[PDB]
Amino acid sequence: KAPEFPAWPQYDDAERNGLVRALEQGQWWRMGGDEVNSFEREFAAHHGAAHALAVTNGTHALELALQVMGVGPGTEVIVPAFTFISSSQAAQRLGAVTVPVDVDAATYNLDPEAVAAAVTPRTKVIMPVHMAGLMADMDALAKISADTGVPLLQDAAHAHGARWQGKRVGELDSIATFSFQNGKLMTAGEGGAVVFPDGETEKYETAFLRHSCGRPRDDRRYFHKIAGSNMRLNEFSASVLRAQLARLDEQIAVRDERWTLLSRLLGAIDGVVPQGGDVRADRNSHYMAMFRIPGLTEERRNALVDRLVEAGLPAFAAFRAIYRTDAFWELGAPDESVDAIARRCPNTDAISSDCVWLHHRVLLAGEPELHATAEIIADAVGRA
Amino acid sequence: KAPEFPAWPQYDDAERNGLVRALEQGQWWRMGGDEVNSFEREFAAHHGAAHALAVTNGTHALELALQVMGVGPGTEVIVPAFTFISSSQAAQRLGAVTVPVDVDAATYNLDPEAVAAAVTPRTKVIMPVHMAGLMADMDALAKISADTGVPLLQDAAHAHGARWQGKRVGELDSIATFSFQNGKLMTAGEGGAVVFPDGETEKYETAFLRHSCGRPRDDRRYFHKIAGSNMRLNEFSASVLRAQLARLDEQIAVRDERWTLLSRLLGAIDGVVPQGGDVRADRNSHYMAMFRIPGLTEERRNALVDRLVEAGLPAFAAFRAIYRTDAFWELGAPDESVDAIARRCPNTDAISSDCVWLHHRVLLAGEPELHATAEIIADAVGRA
Numbered sequence: 001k002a003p004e005f006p007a008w009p010q011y012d013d014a015e016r017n018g019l020v021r022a023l024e025q026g027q028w029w030r031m032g033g034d035e036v037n038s039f040e041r042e043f044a045a046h047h048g049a050a051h052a053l054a055v056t057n058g059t060h061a062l063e064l065a066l067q068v069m070g071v072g073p074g075t076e077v078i079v080p081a082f083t084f085i086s087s088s089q090a091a092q093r094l095g096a097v098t099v100p101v102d103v104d105a106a107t108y109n110l111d112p113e114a115v116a117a118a119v120t121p122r123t124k125v126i127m128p129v130h131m132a133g134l135m136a137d138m139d140a141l142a143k144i145s146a147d148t149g150v151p152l153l154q155d156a157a158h159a160h161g162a163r164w165q166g167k168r169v170g171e172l173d174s175i176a177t178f179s180f181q182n183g184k185l186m187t188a189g190e191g192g193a194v195v196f197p198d199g200e201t202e203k204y205e206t207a208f209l210r211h212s213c214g215r216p217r218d219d220r221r222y223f224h225k226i227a228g229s230n231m232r233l234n235e236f237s238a239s240v241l242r243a244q245l246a247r248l249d250e251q252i253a254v255r256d257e258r259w260t261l262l263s264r265l266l267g268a269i270d271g272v273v274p275q276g277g278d279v280r281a282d283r284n285s286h287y288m289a290m291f292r293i294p295g296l297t298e299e300r301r302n303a304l305v306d307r308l309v310e311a312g313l314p315a316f317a318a319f320r321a322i323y324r325t326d327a328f329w330e331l332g333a334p335d336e337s338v339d340a341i342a343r344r345c346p347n348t349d350a351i352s353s354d355c356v357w358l359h360h361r362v363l364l365a366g367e368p369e370l371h372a373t374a375e376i377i378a379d380a381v382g383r384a
Numbered sequence: 385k386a387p388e389f390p391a392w393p394q395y396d397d398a399e400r401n402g403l404v405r406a407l408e409q410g411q412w413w414r415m416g417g418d419e420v421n422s423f424e425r426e427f428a429a430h431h432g433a434a435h436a437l438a439v440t441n442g443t444h445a446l447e448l449a450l451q452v453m454g455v456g457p458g459t460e461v462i463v464p465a466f467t468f469i470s471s472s473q474a475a476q477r478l479g480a481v482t483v484p485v486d487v488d489a490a491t492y493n494l495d496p497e498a499v500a501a502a503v504t505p506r507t508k509v510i511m512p513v514h515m516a517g518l519m520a521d522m523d524a525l526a527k528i529s530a531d532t533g534v535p536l537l538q539d540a541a542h543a544h545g546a547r548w549q550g551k552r553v554g555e556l557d558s559i560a561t562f563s564f565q566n567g568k569l570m571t572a573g574e575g576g577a578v579v580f581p582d583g584e585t586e587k588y589e590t591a592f593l594r595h596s597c598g599r600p601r602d603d604r605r606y607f608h609k610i611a612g613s614n615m616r617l618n619e620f621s622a623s624v625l626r627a628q629l630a631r632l633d634e635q636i637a638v639r640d641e642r643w644t645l646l647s648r649l650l651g652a653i654d655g656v657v658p659q660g661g662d663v664r665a666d667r668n669s670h671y672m673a674m675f676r677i678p679g680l681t682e683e684r685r686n687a688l689v690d691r692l693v694e695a696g697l698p699a700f701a702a703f704r705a706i707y708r709t710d711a712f713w714e715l716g717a718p719d720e721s722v723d724a725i726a727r728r729c730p731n732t733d734a735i736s737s738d739c740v741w742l743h744h745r746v747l748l749a750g751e752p753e754l755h756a757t758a759e760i761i762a763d764a765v766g767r768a
């Protein structure tokens with residue numbers, strides 16, 4: 001029969017006790033308990049960050065980080081055109097213009113040359129996404145950052161526990177955001193965080209204020225200081241996140257061994273090219289096991305996904321080019337046309353139609369199951 | 385010694401089992417579990433609504449309801465000047481102009497005449513707040529609504545289980561929003577909901593889409609349809625909300641008996657005037673036990689709060705006039721000056737400085753403790 005992969009999410013007594021501990025504090029919001037506060041320190045420490053701010057979800061961690069980095073009406077935000085819609089939707093929500101840029105053909109990370117060209121006097125932030133756990137070129141990006149003076153924002157939703165040139169997400173000198181959505185590498189069904197490197201304490205304080213209806217942590221008289229929203233995380237969610245956190249490093253360790261095996265097996269299938277590597281990214285979190293089948297239309301790629309699901313695999317189409325979603329064109333759209341953005345985003349334009357991913361739970365399975373998985377793929381790709 | 389009041393929040397085995405049940409579904413977001421879905425139906429039914437949409441918090445339920453009711457740049461939203469900042473902050477977040485209007489001197493609900501005067505060609509929504517559980521004049525308001533054609537949005541954060549002219553919040557023909565923040569009448573530490581009356585299915589569908597990154601519930605290929613954000617509630621929070629819901633009606637029943645007693649005891653203190661009633665509001669939820677001490681400056685009212693807390697009471701200053709917060713003036717501010725808004729908001733202007741509230745947990749206590757509470761108040765108000 002079909003191969004079997006470990007469940008996701010996973011839990012055990014840590015989660016069980018955590019939810020009880022949160023419950024029995026008798027206070028369920030961060031102002032009366034200690035679960036969110038403790039999770040923030042544990043999360044930040046794990047990432048080498050000066051501070052962490054746990055929030056309702058990864059899309060709001062992006063909206064908050066952008067907002068304290070000055071994003072707003074009149075500004076532009078550069079984002080990879082290949083990514084989950086939240087990456088641009090967040091800038092759109094703040095009234096800014098999202099400027100989508102091409103990505104690398106092999107890693108699928110934001111392309112540095114492409115961003116250098118898209119820079120403008122309106123650019124307020126450049127947002128690399130560490131695609132499927134593989135960091136983007138933070139050196140090349142950091143250099144464009146200095147030359148232009150446009151700060152970087154890492155969309156680290158796929159990269160919990162990732163490392164670039166030995167450095168943790170939070171030791172790269174830029175703010176970064178995470179997601180704890182159900183399918184993420186650690187999860188409480190929903191959740192997010194904003195992590196602030198050493199030197200960004202002010203933005204951290206402002207972020208706290210904007211995430212709590214502009215209210216000082218100790219205000220009693222409703223002296224709301226600035227605009228914002230409520231993006232507070234509850235204590236129940238925080239306690240489940242603290243148990244997830246504790247298995248993260250080792251889960252990533254099993255995935256790194258398993259991807260080594262799968263990448264090679266896949267790269268052996270004619271027509272099939274697994275996501276590329278980058279040796280400066282010393283610790284790839286392995287959020288997705290991604291591969292292209294260059295030349296496939298969307299419809300053939302979609303049909304192949306369906307055959308893979310039918311054969312017992314947790315396989316998906318990969319992200320749609322963000323300029324090909326209606327959502328993107330509803331507000332803050334760039335003056336270009338759709339073909340004009342596609343013309344300068346040829347890698348996105350193809351990966352949008354030919355890239356497949358399997359759930360990161362496959363990368364926890366045994367070697368036998370990865371062999372069985374790649375046979376299934378090899379057969380199905382013959383018929384695609 | 386000081387009187388003692390029942391804890392808040394409260395829980396028992398219902399919460400315990402609920403969190404386990406959520407946990408052991410092994411899927412923690414609404415797309416894989418049934419807790420949010422079930423809570424939505426239970427909540428809607430409880431309110432007589434056609435549909436309910438559970439969301440991250442009450443401030444986002446307001447942002448979502450406004451957004452599907454067309455709020456945006458170029459529009460105005462009328463809100464009571466006396467209320468929690470989220471009521472205006474939500475319109476501000478969508479790029480609209482919040483137009484604060486006066487409230488009744490006795491119930492502290494949005495004043496109908498004051499809204500009639502503030503109506504404009506830009507007005508897109510009028511937002512009554514049911515202050516401390518006491519509904520606003522939904523008849524007078526519904527009439528202004530028809531004459532102008534400006535739809536109403538009920539900010540029902542304080543009014544879970546409330547009734548106007550025998551009708552439930554969701555049977556009033558207008559969308560309404562709730563909060564499940566820690567101090568609310570039912571809570572999971574954080575949470576919110578949008579409830580949609582019969583006839584508003586379209587806005588419900590659009591609301592679902594905007595609350596999930598514009599993604600159709602069944603999309604697999606990232607066809608994001610419209611702008612929005614992520615305001616999805618997690619399964620853990622939903623299961624705690626379903627156990628809270630089940631005690632609500634009876635908790636409100638104990639509060640209604642206790643307020644009858646306290647209102648009278650308080651109204652007997654010279655200088656002291658308890659929130660007024662309204663017999664068309666047949667079921668007052670009793671979110672706060674509120675009273676004015678007309679003529680007190682803020683500083684005396686604040687000092688009296690402190691003495692009440694020192695005497696063992698869970699007493700607070702009441703909301704600040706929203707035109708007196710810096711937050712309000714940061715974005716979407718109305719062209720008027722601060723004194724110009726104060727001049728047409730004389731009740732808010734005074735209640736902002738002279739109104740005190742006690743936590744609704746006091747209204748669960750025994751009669752002896754309410755007597756002890758009103759003695760404490762009577763002494764302290766002598767010295768204020």
Ligand SMILES: Cc1ncc(COP(=O)(O)O)c(CNc2cccc(C(=O)O)c2)c1O
Binds near residue numbers: 059060086158
């Ligand atoms: C790159 C990236 N950035 C930000 C977000 C936002 O996170 P929240 O969901 O916590 O707001 C994400 C989320 N990623 C995500 C979320 C939901 C479904 C799927 C899917 O691939 O089917 C992917 C993401 O993948």
Ligand SMILES: Cc1ncc(COP(=O)(O)O)c(CNc2cccc(C(=O)O)c2)c1O
Binds near residue numbers: 230441470539575
């Ligand atoms: C009238 C009203 N409207 C909307 C909100 C927003 O709900 P969330 O908090 O779920 O986003 C509220 C919240 N009310 C509230 C929340 C936090 C603290 C205090 C306090 O009085 O000290 C009051 C409120 O009281």
